[PDB]
Design a protein around this nucleic acid. Structure first.
Lengths: 127, 79, 150, 100, 113, 98
RNA sequence: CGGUCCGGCCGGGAACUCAAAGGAGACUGCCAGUGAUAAACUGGAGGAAGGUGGGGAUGACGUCAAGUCAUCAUGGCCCUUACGACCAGGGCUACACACGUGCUACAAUGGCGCAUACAAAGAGAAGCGACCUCGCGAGAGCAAGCGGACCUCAUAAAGUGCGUCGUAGUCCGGAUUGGAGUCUGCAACUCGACUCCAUGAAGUCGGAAUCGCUAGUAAUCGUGGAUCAGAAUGCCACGGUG
RNA sequence: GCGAAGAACCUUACCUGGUCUUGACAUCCACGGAAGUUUUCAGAGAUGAGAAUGUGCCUUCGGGAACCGUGAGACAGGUG
């Protein structure tokens, strides 16, 4: 038995895998506290994961590639909810109320003239 | 230093410098160029270089050799 | 005419159940460097208790509920004329402004570490003795003028 | 652009092939003077100043079609504004407007 | 004392004790501290024999102090008596470092009213 | 030491040239390693449309073409002997170096 | 799925990613209420997401006494022992004087030297130049790999560790003035680019005159390349944090 | 930080001091020479003179093509 989910966020992509066993969390061949640096709140990977009881009976395995290290945490949250929506056929409805099934449509900008990347339209003249 | 290989003068000027001393007490030789480097092989005398309008007299110094004649001759007017 | 898109939601703090206590990591932030902005958050409350701080698990509430503004300035138009009035502060901003005055008191003023300066201002807020900053004196110096309207 | 630029440039490329192009690896010993080897190359180095018109290049290469020394793309050999004019006429294969 | 020749400083900092004298600057001090294998902090009190006088050929390798200090008295006529661009640009507010003269001369050209 | 290039203008033409080249490879000897594609690329060139200066007004043209490198795992020129006698459509270019 | 002291290291494979190609999905369509039971608007449902779904392509008569004959053609037009243009040198980085735009320091969330972490997009066989070295260092050696997802430039910085020093006009700051190296060339006086060691008045986030910004926005820190013997802090391109 | 995706030589304007005048570039016609290579003397240098050496290509045995220095009548030329 395996539960599985995938997520894309800010030019990163994640794969999340859940099995029965003794409780642990593994990410990119290390433990969770040894990734993401010192963190501000460390909560977006935990947000949906409390709903099936935190580190009680599930064996959690993660692999994530690309983007900034903040974007990798966002890709993992969607990978967790894509796996949880097949752990019980009613769980998707409570994750919807919390907003953990939603995805952004805010990808990287093109040109479009005159812009430095996405803003700063020319020089605003002189006095 | 400008330059590490070593500066040179062209044969038509070398032919004049090797016949400039002599006594070194004559009227300044018109060497024209402001690019010439006063490097230690050069002999101590007074010479004349072009400012764009006329020629200006300058001396080949012994207290310093790390210079070109454009550092001593003024070539621009009114500034 | 106040036309803007709907206000920006945020989630309550995962340890303290409040959207205002989640705000401290944005205070004394520069260069977008939130990493170092959190490095004085909750880590100065013991330095504060080892001065004059009391109730160390809630000694941060002094900048939220023990020092509170209520008067704002200046002008109201009435037809062709302008007159001075004391105005009311919006209730959420009114609880979240005394925690924001601290920038001059920590970067333009203050001795040794930014953490000691944070503890220095939270000591004074427990007795409301906080030395006034330009972002408060730009209101408080003028708030007692024209007590008769038009 | 002048019509003299069509001959003058390639005469100055033939000058480079006569005096510098097949001597470019040897520049690390003939123009080296002292850093390596020995004092034996100063009479050989007189070749580096035998011509007197163009030294390391003395010119810039031009677009054949327009005669211009800048504003041209070496992936076409052509001036970048003329690449859009020929693309609007449909004359450059595989090249078309974005959309978009 | 005497850590790099005949030096007269005593109980100054480990890195900055021979500064502003043509003596030994910060990077050269940091280099000799690591070569002698000695503490790079606070004011010196603990110093042994065989540590640093045996390494003088790093810190005082050719020229120091009086070899370069106060050396203008015989290098001034080539600037103030010989006609030269740098001499006029010692007696007038005109720069030499390739910077502008049309813009922000202030004050560097003197007052102004 | 043996280098191969295949270039086309269309995603069907790059495969229908790969198909004949990999059939030539299989016919020359079984190997089961799989031919190298490597990523197809495109390029785009921005131009200013005003006859003098003004960079606040643009136009954009793009050119799309397909490239494959194949790779032979054997050091022996008998592996490419019939590949160097192969005829293809005009819409494709092949370049082989030994 | 297998070899396996337990790393794509290797048989060998095709899920994610990347690079390519096709087809689905969102239509006010469904429900209510409002509206003129029309067009349309707002909630609710489902959904990755709704409400010209978002962003791109882009524009009429006239206007601004617009802007360009040097991107192209061309009227009239100036010049002919010459305004043709070949040659050596100078100049386009002048400054009696006015005003924008970019940036650093004042530290303390820091400076500097070491330790450690993540790219994206490009470009390079008389080149890019590894590892390992020489050196205070730019850079050059001993010299490999590589015709570019394969080798190389290359190291993402902010961050997080470790040492030192700390409201001191300061170990910083820099005006003012010099030396000794490294790179390209025939040759850098004049109008080129790095590095190391010194010189040492002022410097407390600021005069007149004043800007951009409503959210991945203000802000802040990264990386390539064109032009090319040969310079980027400008310009086009490509990302973290907020 | 605008054309300029880049001026120590160039480019190139503008300016100085030299030099040439059917032209650096193109063409219609002859004269003496293949195009060239090697190299010295004077002059800042372009050039102006020296010391030597070629004859190939194409082709009706004639004569051409090409190109260097010369010169008229036509006519070029200009980042004006």
């Amino acid at each position: 038995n395996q539960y599985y989910g995938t997520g894309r966020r800010k030019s990163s992509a994640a794969r999340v895998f859940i099995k029965p066993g003794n409780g642990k969390i593994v990410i990119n061949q290390r433990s969770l506290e040894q990734y993401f640096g010192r963190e501000t709140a460390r909560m977006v990977v935990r947000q949906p994961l409390e709903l099936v009881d935190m580190v009680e009976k599930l064996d959690l395995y993660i692999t994530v590639k690309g983007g900034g290290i903040s974007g990798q945490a966002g890709a993992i949250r969607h990978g967790i909810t894509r796996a949880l929506m097949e752990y019980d056929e009613s769980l998707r409805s409570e994750l919807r109320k919390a907003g953990f099934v939603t995805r952004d449509a805010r990808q990287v900008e093109r040109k479009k003239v005159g812009l430095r990347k996405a803003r700063r339209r020319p020089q605003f003249s002189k006095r | 230093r400008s330059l590490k290989k070593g500066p040179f003068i062209d044969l038509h000027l070398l032919k004049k410098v090797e016949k400039a001393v002599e006594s070194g007490d004559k009227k300044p030789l018109r060497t024209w160029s402001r690019r010439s480097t006063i490097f230690p092989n050069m002999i101590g005398l007074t010479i004349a270089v072009h400012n764009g309008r006329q020629h200006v007299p300058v001396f080949v110094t012994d207290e310093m050799v790390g210079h070109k004649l454009g550092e001593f001759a003024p070539t621009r007017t009114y500034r | 005419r106040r036309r803007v898109i709907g206000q920006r939601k945020i989630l309550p703090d995962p340890k303290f159940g409040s959207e205002l206590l989640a705000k401290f990591v944005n205070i004394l932030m520069v260069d977008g460097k939130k990493s170092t902005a959190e490095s004085i958050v909750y880590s100065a409350l013991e330095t504060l208790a080892q001065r004059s701080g009391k109730s160390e698990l809630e000694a941060f509430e002094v900048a939220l509920e023990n020092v509170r503004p209520t008067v704002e300035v200046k002008s109201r138009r009435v037809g062709g004329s302008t007159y001075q009035v004391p105005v009311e502060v919006r209730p959420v901003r009114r609880n979240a402004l005394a925690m924001r005055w601290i920038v001059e008191a920590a970067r333009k003023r203050g001795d040794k570490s930014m953490a000691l300066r944070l503890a220095n201002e939270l000591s004074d807020a427990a007795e409301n003795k906080g030395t006034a900053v330009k972002k408060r004196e730009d209101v408080h110096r003028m708030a007692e003028a024209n007590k008769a309207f038009a | 652009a002048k019509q003299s630029m069509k001959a003058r440039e390639v005469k100055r490329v033939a000058l480079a092939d006569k005096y510098f192009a097949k001597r470019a690896e040897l520049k690390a010993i003939i123009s080296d003077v002292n850093a390596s080897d020995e004092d034996r190359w100063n009479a050989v180095l007189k070749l580096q100043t035998l011509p007197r018109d163009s030294s390391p290049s003395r010119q810039r290469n031009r677009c054949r079609q327009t005669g211009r020394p800048h504003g041209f793309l070496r992936k076409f050999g052509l001036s970048r504004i003329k690449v859009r004019e020929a693309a609007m006429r449909g004359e450059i294969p595989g090249l078309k407007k974005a959309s978009w | 004392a005497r850590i790099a020749g005949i030096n007269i400083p005593d109980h100054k900092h480990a890195v900055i004790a021979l500064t502003s004298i043509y003596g030994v600057g910060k990077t050269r001090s940091k280099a000799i501290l690591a070569a002698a294998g000695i503490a790079e902090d606070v004011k010196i009190s603990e110093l042994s024999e065989g540590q640093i006088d045996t390494l003088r050929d790093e810190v005082a390798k050719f020229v120091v102090e009086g070899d370069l200090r106060r050396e203008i008295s015989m290098s001034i006529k080539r600037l103030m008596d010989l006609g030269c661009y740098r001499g006029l640009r010692h007696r007038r507010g005109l720069p030499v470092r390739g910077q502008r003269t049309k813009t922000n001369a202030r004050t560097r050209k003197g007052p102004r009213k | 030491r043996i280098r191969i290039r295949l270039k086309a203008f269309d995603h069907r033409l790059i495969d229908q040239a790969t198909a004949e080249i990999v059939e030539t490879a299989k016919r020359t000897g079984a190997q089961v390693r799989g031919p190298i594609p490597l990523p197809t690329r495109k390029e785009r060139f921005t131009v200013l449309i005003s006859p003098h200066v003004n960079k606040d007004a643009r136009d954009q043209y793009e050119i799309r073409t397909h490239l494959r490198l194949v790779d032979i795992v054997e050091p022996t020129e008998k592996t490419v002997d019939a590949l160097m006698r192969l005829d293809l459509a005009a819409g494709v270019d092949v370049q082989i170096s030994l």
